[PDB]
């Protein structure tokens, strides 16, 4: 129960979009349904692009964290120098 609820994790939005598409298709006014399907597919394309952008942002954040770790190593070296100064 709780495990599946947690694994559900957005995902609900894409699932609802796919479900609405399947429902409209099973129902298939037809031009309006095709246009709604096109709207849903464009929304899904925007969601895929957003996921790709989020992955790129995570990669850039990892790179920045590596740079900050190098900076913290330099700060520890400066702390040893300040220990000599102390």
């Amino acid at each position: 129960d709780d495990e599946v609820i947690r694994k559900r994790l957005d995902d609900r939005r894409i699932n609802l979009l796919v479900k609405s598409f399947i429902k409209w298709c099973n129902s298939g006014e037809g031009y309006s349904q095709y246009q709604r399907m096109l709207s849903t597919l464009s929304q899904c394309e925007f969601s895929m692009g957003k996921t790709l952008l989020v992955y790129d942002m995570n990669l850039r954040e990892m790179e920045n964290y590596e740079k900050i770790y190098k900076e913290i190593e330099c700060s520890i070296a400066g702390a040893h120098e300040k220990i000599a100064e102390c």
Binding site: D1, D2, I5, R6, R8, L9, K19, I22, K23, N26
Partner: protein, 210 residues
């Protein structure tokens, strides 16, 4: 025997073949044996086919049971509302032990309001102190130290610059409603705030008992 031959016969081409097998199984409307004869991709395709068929009766329910080999709604709503967007302010006093301890130890030091403002912002950020409780503790320290008045008045003016003006009114109303069901210090604080025009008379007057 055509079904057995089709099953024995059959990543673009592989995905196409898997989708074709799923479509054939959907058009079937015993297949479990052939499914187990050959994977995790097969299990995922079976789950997708079951979801689509549920989207697209008794026969379908029986097929799902064979292939298997209300309060939940509110529970999921609570789980998502807690995980995704929780207030998580550590309001009262004792949740953030280090936080309020260091806050009061910073307010009670020997006696520059900008430095204390930045220190309080840093403490809020590090220990997740609720802003309203911070303002309450500040007002109380202002009560117990009635010598340094203008300093805390500039601090209260700068702090309320970054908050809603009606927070002070409601907080004073709470601190007065507590004693309803009232020392001189409480009245002194409200009088000082009213004099320097920090809060209007209407809200405080409404909060009073008589």
């Amino acid at each position: 025997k055509n079904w057995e031959k089709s099953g024995r016969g059959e990543s673009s081409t592989y995905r196409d073949f898997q989708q074709a097998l799923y479509e054939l199984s959907y058009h079937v409307i015993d297949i479990s044996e052939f499914r187990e004869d050959m994977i995790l991709a097969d299990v995922f395709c079976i789950l997708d086919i079951e979801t689509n068929c549920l989207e697209e009766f008794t026969q379908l329910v029986l097929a799902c049971l064979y292939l298997v080999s209300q309060q939940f709604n509110q529970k999921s709503v609570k789980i998502k509302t807690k995980l995704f967007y929780k207030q998580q302010k550590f309001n009262l006093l004792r949740e953030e032990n280090e936080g309020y301890a260091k806050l009061i130890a910073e307010l009670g030091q020997d006696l520059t309001s900008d430095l204390i403002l930045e220190n309080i912002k840093s403490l809020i950020g590090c220990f997740n102190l609720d802003p309203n409780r911070v303002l309450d503790v500040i007002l109380e320290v202002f009560e117990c130290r009635p010598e340094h008045d203008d300093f805390f008045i500039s601090l209260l003016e700068s702090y309320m610059s970054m908050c809603e003006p009606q927070t002070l009114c409601h907080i004073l109303g709470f601190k007065f409603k507590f004693y309803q069901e009232t020392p001189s210090s409480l009245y002194r604080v409200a009088a000082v705030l009213l004099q320097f025009n920090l809060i209007d008379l209407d809200d405080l007057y409404v909060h009073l008992l008589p």
